[PDB]
Amino acid sequence: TIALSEIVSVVNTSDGRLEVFGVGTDKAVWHNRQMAPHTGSPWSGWSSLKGQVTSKPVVYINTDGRLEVFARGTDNALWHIWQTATNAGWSNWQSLGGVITSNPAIYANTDGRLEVFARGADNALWHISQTTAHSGPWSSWASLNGVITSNPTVHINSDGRLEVFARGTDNALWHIWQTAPDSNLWSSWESLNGIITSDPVVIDTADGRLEVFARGADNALWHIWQTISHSGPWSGWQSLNGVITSAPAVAKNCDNRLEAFARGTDNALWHTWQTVSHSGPWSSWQSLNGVITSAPTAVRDADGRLEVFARGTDNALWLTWQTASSWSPWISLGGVLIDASAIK
């Protein structure tokens, strides 16, 4: 098992609007979007992109600005749907085949080719890519091996190499990296040790270091980072303390200060942040209240403010954001969302 998952995927569109993707009780993908590129914008309300998903749906922006959503189908194949034009209409759901046993994890190579990673029926990591920038056709599936017990997460290093993180059978954090940008040449799997009890989340620091966050065996928030830009060694695991009852979410403030969010034991949203400057000391854990039934999902909007989404007791999606002084009261975006995570 893993800590309670994020229930939505969110992106900041090519025109600076937040757009959020979730799953309804009938297993269709629904989306909600800001009308205007500003904190506290009115929302569309939930509309259906249809489909029948058995994973968290994961949105990623092509290098031409077209959103593309990836999800496991009821046949355990990887399916996707894409905007036919930037912030315009959507394709039908189409199958990329395979058999996957995790949520998909997506990143753009330096050459604009999306690459998708997912656990397979053999519990190894598999991958498939666009063959040219933001375009089909897609490559054949292949495996990067390993034995995976969490959803994987991919990021890009500051030198353009993709790097993937996942829990192993020993509950350690393991990773594998491209040896060159845009490559099908990968390293061996290596262990970053620790004991993690959530999916890992990964982000790039202002200074081009990958930093991974995960819940520990003691239900504290732990993190580990590249000690120098796009390079080993890693820092070794450090505790940010707290007692968390969901996966953590991480985002960057517009001054690049990292900020971590998670559900506490009182089922409120809690957060801790780098103080003063990026890579500065972490704050005490503080409450943003609410009563939430999912991990929080954190994103920086077009005004450079963090906005956090979480499911409420009513299964609606609720929203709170940074203000000059503190954070807004929670407001409901309605809907009825389920946790469709392929790994729980």
Ligand X SMILES: OC[C@H]1O[C@@H](O)[C@H](O)[C@@H](O)[C@@H]1O
| Residue 211 marked as a ligand binder | no
Pairing of strands 286-289, 238-239: unpaired
* Least distance CB 332 / ligand X (angstroms): 21
Q: Which residues from 115-154 bind ligand X, rule CB under 6 A?
A: 130, 134-136
Min CB(211)–Na ion separation in Å: 12
Print the binding letters for residues 262-301 with ligand X: x by CB under 6 A, - otherwise. Answer: -----------xx----x----------------------
138 has binding-site annotation: yes
Local structure of 330: helix, strand or coil:
coil
Query: Is 131 a binder of a copy of itself (CB under 8 A)?
Result: no
CA dihedral 181, 186, 187, 190 (to 10 degrees): 100
Q: Which is nearer to a copy of itself, 217 or 254 (CB)?
A: 254
CA distance 327 to 333: 17
Structural tokens at position 169: 């059978």
Minimum gap (Å) between residue 303 Cβ and a copy of itself: 5
User: If 0-12 CB within 10 Å is exposed, 13-18 middle and 19+ buried, where does residue 85 land?
Assistant: exposed
Distance CA 196, CA 171 (A): 6
Tell me which residue of 96, 100, 18 sits closest to 55, measured CA to CA. 100
Q: Of 63, 253, 267, 315, which lies in the binding site for ligand X, with binding defined by CB under 6 A?
A: 253
Give the other-Cβ count within 10 Å of 136's Cβ.
10
Torsion over CA: 180, 70, 62, 21 (sign): negative
* Whole-angstrom distance, CA of residue 262 vs CA of residue 240: 12
Q: Name the one range near a copy of itself by CB under 8 A: 137-145, 146-154, 252-260, 331-339.
A: 252-260
How far is the C-alpha of 214 from the C-alpha of 200, rounded, in Å? Answer: 5
97 known ligand binder: no
Other CB atoms within a 10 A radius of the CB of residue 253 amount to 16
Name which of Cl ion, Na ion, ligand X, none residue 245 binds, using a CB cut-off of 5 to 8 Å depending on partner kind.
Cl ion
Q: 238 a known binding residue?
A: no
Could you say which of Na ion, ligand X, Cl ion, none residue 177 binds, taking C-beta under 5 to 8 angstroms by partner kind?
ligand X
Task: Spell out the long-range contacts of 231-235 with Cβ–Cβ below 8 A and sequence spacing 24 or more.
Answer: 234/192
Which residues 55-94 are close enough to bind ligand X by CB under 6 A?
62, 66, 68, 82
Point out which span in 8-16, 37-45, 255-263, 309-317 binds ligand X (CB under 6 A): 255-263
Question: Measured from the CB of residue 244, what is the shortest distance to a copy of itself in angstroms?
Answer: 28
The verdict on 14 binding a copy of itself (CB under 8 A) reads: yes
Which span (23-31, 39-47, 164-172, 250-258) binds ligand X, by CB under 6 A?
A: 250-258
226 binds ligand X (CB under 6 A): yes
Q: Which of residues 139-168 bind a copy of itself (CB under 8 A)?
A: 158-160
**Cα dihedral 23→27→76→85 (10° resolution):** -60
x/- mask, a copy of itself, residues 182-221, rule CB under 8 A, reads x----------------------xxxx-------------
Paired residues of 342 in beta bridges: none
Bridge partners for 211 per DSSP = 203, 225
Binding test (CB under 8 A) with a copy of itself, winner from 121, 142, 217, 254:
254
**Nearer Cβ to a copy of itself (27/230):** 230
Annotated binding site for Mg(2+): 12-13
